Amino acid sequence: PISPIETVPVKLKPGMDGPKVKQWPLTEEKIKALVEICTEMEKEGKISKIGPENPYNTPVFAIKKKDSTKWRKLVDFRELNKRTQDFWEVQLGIPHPAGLKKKKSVTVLDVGDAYFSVPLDEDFRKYTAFTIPSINNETPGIRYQYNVLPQGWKGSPAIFQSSMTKILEPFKKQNPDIVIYQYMDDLYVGSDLEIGQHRTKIEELRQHLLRWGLTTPDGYELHPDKWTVQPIVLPEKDSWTVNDIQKLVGKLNWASQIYPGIKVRQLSKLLRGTKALTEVIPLTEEAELELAENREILKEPVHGVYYDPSKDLIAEIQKQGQGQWTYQIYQEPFKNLKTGKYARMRGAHTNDVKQLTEAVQKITTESIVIWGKTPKFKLPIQKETWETWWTEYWQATWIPEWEFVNTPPLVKLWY
Amino acid sequence: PISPIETVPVKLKPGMDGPKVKQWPLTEEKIKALVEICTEMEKEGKISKIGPENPYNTPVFAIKKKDSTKWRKLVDFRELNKRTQDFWEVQLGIPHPAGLKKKKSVTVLDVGDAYFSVPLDEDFRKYTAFTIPSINNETPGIRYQYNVLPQGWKGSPAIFQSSMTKILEPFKKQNPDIVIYQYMDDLYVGSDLEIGQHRTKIEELRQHLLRWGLTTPDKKHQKEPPFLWMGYELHPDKWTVQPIVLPEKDSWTVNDIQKLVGKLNWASQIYPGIKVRQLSKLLRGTKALTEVIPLTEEAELELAENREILKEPVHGVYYDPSKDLIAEIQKQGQGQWTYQIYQEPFKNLKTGKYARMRGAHTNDVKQLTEAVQKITTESIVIWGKTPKFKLPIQKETWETWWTEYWQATWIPEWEFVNTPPLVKLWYQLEKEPIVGAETFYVDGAANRETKLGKAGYVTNKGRQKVVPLTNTTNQKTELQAIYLALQDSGLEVNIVTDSQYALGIIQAQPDKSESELVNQIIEQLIKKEKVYLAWVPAHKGIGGNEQVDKLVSAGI
């Protein structure tokens, strides 16, 4: 419960106002759930009812961590975050634990409940107001504003860091080769142990935080040892039909934007004429010279590419076939930090929005783990389509920022 | 009278001060009536006389036409509404009757002088001050101010709805299965109770409301079936919208356009396609409420069309949650879609028509999808659940569309509804090139400054062609060029472009478009047999592309 605390003063970035985001229709199952969750969250004195004289608003919806369990309230604080002061030095976390990605195992725990013990600046509270819709607009929305650190907020981990570090101090002493990183409401716990003798050390943390007051839910596993890159790969039907060599000089002309150590010359020369595509042209040993050179430089890490903590990470995903998607994380166009290929979709999971929503989640946990920041997504979907469905498959406590796009032939250039 | 409820604290927009607007003289008979209306108003405490220290002011006016035999006082809070804080208007829209379930007994109460019963933050009061002018001008201005919620003021709706929910909250807990619906001064009460046991619950409510300053007149829709609730008529087993009648007139004032936009806004919720865009700008363009504004051709065309919309009589049936929700969609005018959400066959809750811009170019199944996505959302707002869908597109046609479209898409549960205007894909662009089919190495160009430009191919058979074009863009001549390779060619063909623009438009399988040319290409594409579109980089020494550019470029 709340501890007698003097609140940390928090203000919105200069110039900006609080969020006035609108609430999107929720189903009856999600309303019934949020009404329960908040009547109790209200008895507990965590959120209080508010009038119409508080102009602000943030979207509320409900997820379900995994299969057949408890609805979890998730407030979309993305907008409030953008408008909140980027804190002094006590960051959301600490200088990024570069070893988190090198762990044989990483378990993700929802520490979100820790936030409900610290009171929040009475002045800022107005800006955390949200509204529960009503089926058919019968009951004029139930409005509430948080009285304690909200779970979605960016400020909570910033405010609650002194605490968390104090709670974790013992555990980190006892286990000093078990790397722990906190991203907002989650605690990323990594150790080079056996999964069964990993799933114990985690429960010790589960029970320890439990003793110190953190009621974590009774663990998501990641093994960042198995993470791989999907490179640019050239075809088997190299130098055959004219068309084939046109698909080749097409693909190799783009890569130059990335690695300009490629050359077009000994292929376009083969392309000279006004020949039919269907023509199996000559694989000259001058061309073959270019090609193996080409194949080579692709199997190679790019130059100049290095993470810069100051620029946003951007992700671009491409639809690629039967439950196959590929993606790219970069910061400055063409200077990729990672590229990969999410692919785990068939039949029951052969729903595109479901697939895209779970790819968006893996690319996001991988960036938190790898860089400790979420990327801004360029999603291969139409605004309206994604928006009517993402909340049916979202199971993550954060929501990344996103933009909508239109893929040209990049599809054929990444697989 | 003035409720004794806790007032909501209202702030002015930060930085702004209250309205200091000038009162223009009316007629001595309007004035006398404004004094008369104001004494009756102070007799009840709705307003209160003020003195020389209050520095704000709001324009008073008296409207001509009597309503329910009422000649009243209209205040122009346009300025105070610019200065009053933002409020958070809560709902996803207004309720919809098809969402209602059949409730044995129904009663619809109206809150007489709703706004004027709820009180206003004592601190905001100084800002709502006004002044009734003097007849004998040797007499100064008759200055007042509100104590209670004003009519056109920004906050009144927001706040009365807040004040009402709290006055009704205690009453809704003691009686949980009786649905009380509240919107504007229309209080709907209903239950599965019997008339006598029911009317007791109402008296109890109208009594409760009375303890709180809220007058609920004898004009209670005592259970007599056609209930008028929110501009809909609720019949025992069906509902119907009350006809929305717009004002026909030639002389329009700032106020009458104002009233109309309001009504149009009201109606846009019940009927779609009701634009207010053009009439609205007329309010932006002129001040004083009494002065006359002339509709522009656009505003008068907007009225003609909204009025055309409001001509279609709307109706339907109530909800029975014990049954599924089925939604059926049909294609109509080249991008005109109609749907009906029903439960019992032929028994429609809602019916509507979707039609929206799917781009500059557009594809058909792509529009179906946009339709399914807008009905889903509308079902969730109204009923809290998605409908099972009934769609006029073969199962495998959708399959082939999502298998090949580079964007992700999804349509929830549906069944094939074999019915005319079946949505399908007119043409399947080839994957690998066709053997032997003539290959047209296409290209086009133009000048930004002269608009003149060239367009045309050079095939593998030596054939060549370049047409000169006027009034084009460096980008329209690249589509024109693919047009040529399609016209002047066999049923099978293998075009080659250096255009990234043309490749995207053609690859997305458009069925319609806004670029006439693009339409010309769609028609060609369907008439062909085996098209294979391919892309290749420009300004380089590829194939024919290298030689077609020279014909097409300017100074070489």
Which of B426, B446, B462 is where one domain is finished? Answer: B426
Q: Do B383 and A253 touch (CB under 8 A)?
A: no
> HSE on the CB side for A73, CA within 13 Å?
24
Nearest CA in chain B to A384: B373
Question: B96 to chain A: nearest residue by CA?
Answer: A136
Angle (CA) B105 A134 A356, round 5°: 140
Are B93 and A353 in contact (CB < 8 Å)?
A: no
Is B179 in Cβ contact with A138 (below 8 Å)? Answer: yes
A270 and A149 belong to one structural domain: no
Q: Check: CB of residue B228 under 8 Å from CB of residue B221.
A: yes
As for how many domains chain B has, the answer is 5
Q: Which of residues 80-109 of B touch A (CB under 8 A)?
A: 85-96, 99-100
Closest-approach residue (CA) in chain B for A318: B406
Q: Do B407 and A131 touch (CB under 8 A)?
A: no
**Mutate: best of A53, A237, A393, partner B, most B CBs <10 A:** A53
* Structure tokens, B442: 């296409």
| Cβ separation B535–A134 shorter than 8 A | no
Which chain B residue has its CA at the smallest distance from A248's CA?
B536
Do A249 and A356 lie in a common domain?
no
Are A71 and A191 contained in the same domain?
no
Residues A3, A134 share a domain: yes
What is the greatest pairwise CA distance in chain A? Answer: 82
Number of structural domains found in chain A: 4
Residues B339 and B477 in one domain: no
> Is the same domain home to A103 and A179?
yes
- Ligand-binding annotation for B320, yes or no, is no
Radius of gyration of the CA atoms of chain B, in A: 32
- Cα separation of A398 and A153, whole Å? 9
Rounded Cα distance between B276 and B169, Å, is 36
Report d(CA B460, CA A274) in Å as an integer.
5
Contact B373 A388 (CB under 8 A): yes
Backbone angles phi, psi at A228, to 5 degrees: -130, 165
CA-based end-to-end distance of chain A: 52
Nearest-CA residue of chain A relative to B169? Answer: A139
Residue-number span of the structural domain to which B177 is assigned? 91-115+157-225
Chain A hits for B183, CB-CB cut-off 8 Å, are: 137
How many whole angstroms separate alpha carbon B466 and alpha carbon B481? 9
Residue to mutate among A277, A345, A392, with most B CBs inside 10 A, is A277
| Residues B290, B292: Cα–Cα separation, whole Å | 6
Q: What is the CATH number of the domain that holds A150?
A: 3.10.10.10
The answer to whether A388 contacts B99, with C-beta atoms less than 8 Å apart, is no
**CA distances in angstroms from B30 to B133, B226, B251, B290, listed in the order given:** 10, 39, 21, 14
Interchain pair B410, A385: CB under 8 A = yes
- Which chain B residues are Cβ-neighbours of A384 within 8 angstroms? 370, 373-374
CB B458 within 8 A of CB B464: yes
Q: Are residues A108 and A233 in the same domain?
A: no
Question: What kind and span of H or E run contains B74?
Answer: strand B73-75
- For strand B496-497 and strand B534-535, is the pairing parallel, antiparallel, or unpaired? parallel
CA distance B73 to chain A (A): 27
Both structure tokens of B18: 């209250």
Range of the domain at A24: 1-92+116-156
Q: Are residues B291 and B434 in the same domain?
A: no
Domain co-membership, B244 together with B347 = no
Same domain, B253 and B379: no
Helix (H) or strand (E) segment spanning residue B493: strand B492-493
Name which of A181, A203, A182 is nearest A103 in CA terms. A181
Angle between helices B500-507 and B516-527 (to 10 degrees): 60
Name the residue among B407, B458, B534 with its Cβ closest to that of A246. B534
Length of chain B measured in residues: 556
Which method was it determined by?
Answer: X-ray
**What CATH number is attached to the domain comprising A172?**
3.30.70.270
Among B208, B225, B242, the domain boundary falls at B225
Whether residue B138 sits in one domain with residue B9: yes
**Helix spans in B44-176 (H):** 80-83, 156-174
- Strand B347-354 and strand B315-317: pairing? unpaired
Separation of alpha carbons B203 and B210, rounded Å: 10
Cβ-based neighbours of B516, under 8 Å, separated by 6 or more: none
CB atoms within 10 A of CB B516: 9
Q: Is residue B324 a known part of a binding site?
A: no
- Assess whether A266 and A335 both reside in one domain: no
Query: Does A76 belong to an annotated binding site?
Result: no
- Residues 6 or more apart from A69 whose CB is under 8 A from it? none
Q: Is the dihedral of CA A114, A117, A123, A127 positive or negative?
A: positive
Q: Using CB atoms, which residue from A135, A241, A250 is nearest to B536? A: A250
Question: Both B449 and B507 in a single domain?
Answer: yes
Token look-up 């948080």 returns A146
Q: Are residues A246 and A366 in the same domain?
A: no
Asked if B363 and B402 sit in the same domain, the reply is: yes
Q: Is B464 on the interface with A (CB under 8 A)?
A: no
Instruction: Label each residue of chain A as H, E or C.
Output: CCCCCCCCCCCECCCCCCCECCCCCCCHHHHHHHHHHHHHHHHCCCEEECCCCCCCECCEEEEECCCCCCEEEEECCHHHHHHECCCCCCCCCCCCCCCCCCCCCEEEEECHHHHHHCECCCCHHHHHCEEECCHHHCCCCEEEEECECCCCCCHHHHHCHHHHHHHHHHHHHHCCCCEEEEECCEEEEECCCCHHHCCCHHHHHHHHHHHCCCCCCCCEEECCCCCCCCCCCCCCCCCCEHHHHHHHHHHHHHHHHHCCCCCCHHHHCCCCCCCCCCCECCCCCCHHHHHHHHHHHHCCCCCCCCCCCCCCCEEEEEECCCCEEEEEEEEECCEEEEEECCECCCHHHCCHHHHHHHHHHHHHHHHHHHCCCCCEEEECCCHHHHHCCHHHCCCCCCCCCEEECCCCCHHHHHC
Is the minimum CB–CB distance between B441 and chain A shorter than 8 Å?
Answer: yes
How far, in whole angstroms, is CA B33 from its chain's centroid? 40
Resolution for the entry shown, Å: 2.7
Q: Give how far A28 is from chain B: nearest CA, Å.
A: 5
A317/chain B closest Cα distance in angstroms: 10
How far apart are the CA of A96 and the nearest CA of chain B, in angstroms?
34
Do both B442 and B518 map to the same domain? Answer: yes
Domain CATH for B313:
3.30.70.270
In Å, what is the CA distance from B480 to each residue of B92, B440, B459, B492, B496?
Answer: 46, 13, 16, 19, 13
Q: Which residues pair with B350 in a beta bridge?
A: B341
Q: How far is CA B512 from CA A407, B359, B425, B516, B522, in A?
A: 21, 10, 12, 9, 7
User: If you count residue pairs, one on A and one on B, with CB atoms under 8 Å apart, how many are there?
Assistant: 196
Shared domain check, A180 and A130: no
- Choose the final residue of a domain: A226, A255, A279: A226
Query: Hey, are the CB atoms on A274 and B380 less than 8 Å from each other?
Result: no
Q: Is B496 on the interface with A (CB under 8 A)?
A: yes
Tell me, yes or no, whether A69 and A8 share the same domain. Answer: yes
Shared domain check, A125 and A22: yes
Please indicate whether, in this complex, the C-beta atoms of B500 and A389 are within 8 angstroms of each other: no
B374 part of contact set with chain A, CB < 8 Å = yes
B276: three-class secondary structure by DSSP: coil
Quote the CA–CA distance of A23 and A32 in Å, as a whole number. 16
Cβ-count burial of B372 within 10 angstroms (0-12 exposed, 13-18 middle, 19+ buried)? buried
Shared domain for A141 and A2, answered yes or no, is yes
* Same domain as B136, residue B39: yes
Which among B289, B319, B349 is the end of a domain? B319
> In this structure, are B364 and B291 located in the same domain?
no
- The CATH number assigned to the domain holding B54 equals 3.10.10.10
Same domain, B187 and B75: no
Instruction: Determine whether the interchain pair A136/B383 forms a contact, defined as Cβ–Cβ distance below 8 Å.
Output: yes
Same domain? For B10 and B138 the reply is: yes
A246 and B536: CB-CB below 8 Å? yes
Residues of A in contact with B162 (CB under 8 A): 51-52
Helix axes B365-383, B395-404, angle to 10 degrees: 100
Dihedral Cα B151, B152, B153, B159, nearest 10 deg: 60
**Do residues B47 and B145 touch, judged by C-beta distance below 8 A?**
yes
- Short-list A344, A345, A349, A245, CA closest to A291: A245
Q: Which residues contact B294 (CB under 8 A, 6 or more apart)?
A: B252
Specify burial of residue B236 (Cβ count, 10 A radius: 0-12, 13-18, 19+). exposed
Determine if residue B549 is labeled as part of a ligand binding site.
yes
Q: Give the B window 158-217 contacts with A, CB below 8 Å.
A: 158-159, 161-162, 165, 179, 181-183
CB contact under 8 A, B494 and A277: yes
